[PDB]
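DATA SHEET
Item: assembly model
Revision: 1
Owner: S.N.
Input lines:
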Amino acid sequence: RLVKALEDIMVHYDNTTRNSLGNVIQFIYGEDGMDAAHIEKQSLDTIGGSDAAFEKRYRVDLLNTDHTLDPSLLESGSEILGDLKLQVLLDEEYKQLVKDRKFLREVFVDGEANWPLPVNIRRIIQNAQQTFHIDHTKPSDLTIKDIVLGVKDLQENLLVLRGKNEIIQNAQRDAVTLFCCLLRSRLATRRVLQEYRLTKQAFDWVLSNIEAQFLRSVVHPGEM
Amino acid sequence: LEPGHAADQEQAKLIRSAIEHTTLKSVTIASEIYYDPDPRSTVIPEDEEIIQLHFSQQSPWLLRLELDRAAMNDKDLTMGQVGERIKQTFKNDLFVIWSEDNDEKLIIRCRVVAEEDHMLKKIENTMLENITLRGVENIERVVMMKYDRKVPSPTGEYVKEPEWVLETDGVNLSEVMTVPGIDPTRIYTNSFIDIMEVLGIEAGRAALYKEVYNVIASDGSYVNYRHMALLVDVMTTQGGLTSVTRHGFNRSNTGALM
Amino acid sequence: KAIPKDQRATTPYMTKYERARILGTRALQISMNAPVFVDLEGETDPLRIAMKELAEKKIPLVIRRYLPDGSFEDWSVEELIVD
Amino acid sequence: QENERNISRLWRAFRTVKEMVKDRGYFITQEEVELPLEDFKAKYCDSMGRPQRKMMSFQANPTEESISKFPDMGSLWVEFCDEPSVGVKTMKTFVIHIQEKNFQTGIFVYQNNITPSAMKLVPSIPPATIETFNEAALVVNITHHELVPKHIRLSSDEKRELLKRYRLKESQLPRIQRADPVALYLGLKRGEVVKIIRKSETSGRYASYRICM
């Protein structure tokens, strides 16, 4: 019975999910356009934890020393201290994360943190680390602008839908909401500098992969 | 329960009593019909000690019946309500006196204003089952259980945290949804048909997903979300639930050869 | 019908069904002695020749992708991206 | 005691209606929806201890931007009746009172039932519209429940747009029923499209559309 009921639903070439008559069943497949086989359980790192821990993990302030960043993480950290053009960004970033932590606790009301998502990011971190032989105990060529812009830019490329009007540009807004939340938590600058210590060269490789993999996870129109 | 009144057994007990359906025939031991002719004096010894006791027209057939304490003291009750319940039930044509809650034989007796002993007999039937002491319909055996509930802490991390939760046999969603003291938002039912009627289709869909996911996951399996959501969406795109049967989908207009 | 080339909105990648059907027909054609737009460096299996052309973007076909309403965009395999 | 109950109940049912209309777009001051119980009877119940529904009734107008969205939107009269059953003559007044003052639409709470006489009285005066609400239904605002997601009515302009972005005929949309409770709580009419926005465990936020068949 199940097969004869959902026998003709098919993912169409606009990511709707319509049956033989053409009625929309869902407006993107599975509400994110992702292919089931490309999903993996990963952990949203902003949902959980005490806020103190959340503060400790993501907060970065240059001008003041409550959560300051030790320069020896990166080359230009010395002359960074107390900047202000950038000390703006960090908040704007850290603002975003706070919104996410707020948002996710609305989505997952029981603070559940491990959820199946497309591209596995940890694994993309490693492959970068090992491919480039990440010399810890050694500062990094990355500059706060490249990180924060890098993440913020990348999101514009994760295209599930690529129409050009207003309606479509908001579906696309949504399809990648939760995924971006993940991607932001993983790639916050504190992590990138302190924890992964990626070089300039490593980063864009991490970025350019996440784009390549993500785009491969989209469901293929024509799929029954 | 109400959001503040989480894990206060007492407050829970009051609600459980507030909705659990209680008919008379669940508290009473047995009903007797006499012919004690004088309205005032009663051949039964005790009834006199209460006849004047509240006398300080009516038929000669005493109808008297007897309740357990522990029954009447489980979902505990006061005959003061119970009487007025009867009083409010028919009329004030059926005079009623009842024993005191202190009294060691929980006693209610009544009288009336061809032969009635059949109509008298009729009366107790009604009294037996047609009379609800309290509760709502269809709601029996309101178990009261404890549940942990991960909630955030004031430090902002999640902590398990318990609460009382009245499970229930039988369903009457709309009625129970208003009974004060409960949290009328987060109330559930495994009969998603009723959710669809009371909260409309979109909730009916989300409840439906909930029920399928229980069936699947109950035995430990795990199906990716999109497969279940896709099904649950097919069942609710006409508004209202469509069964996966000859009647449901095979009655759409999807081409005869299909 | 015929969405204009500047308004094509569907994905710029090759769905795996497009890739499978392309290599089918292309191989089928080759197996009918259709001319071959690549140097068969020793290859003799029509499917393997087809996988070679496709890797050189030398298959002269084009994919007509029907939208659910009835209209369609046209992509030429030479311009679609393969994974 | 019993009166107290039917105060609190009638208290809440009131609050719902004020929310329901506020959601429907009209202007309701925020903190007037939250009018506590005591000031309620201290405003609406007689001193003797009874509720004067017949003056609880009230009127409200489209917020200034709803006109910017639905300009044809007009004012609306909310009314409670007191006789537990409602006969024609009571409704006879309503259908004209709505007509005379000529609001866009009028909502008729009641308490126990409506005599099928006045039941036919309703579909009487277009372009007005008459909605009845057994106040039992209103004691709980169902849209606050968790499983109910935010529904949002769509200006016939947006509708005309969405059908074009997806290339849809109206019949190809997911449906809703005008009898559906949430449809009632906003008073849709056939051919209106609500946009449903729910939380989605796979993409955070997701937006769906049902047309009110």
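QC remark: The two ends of chain D are 44 Å apart (CA to CA).
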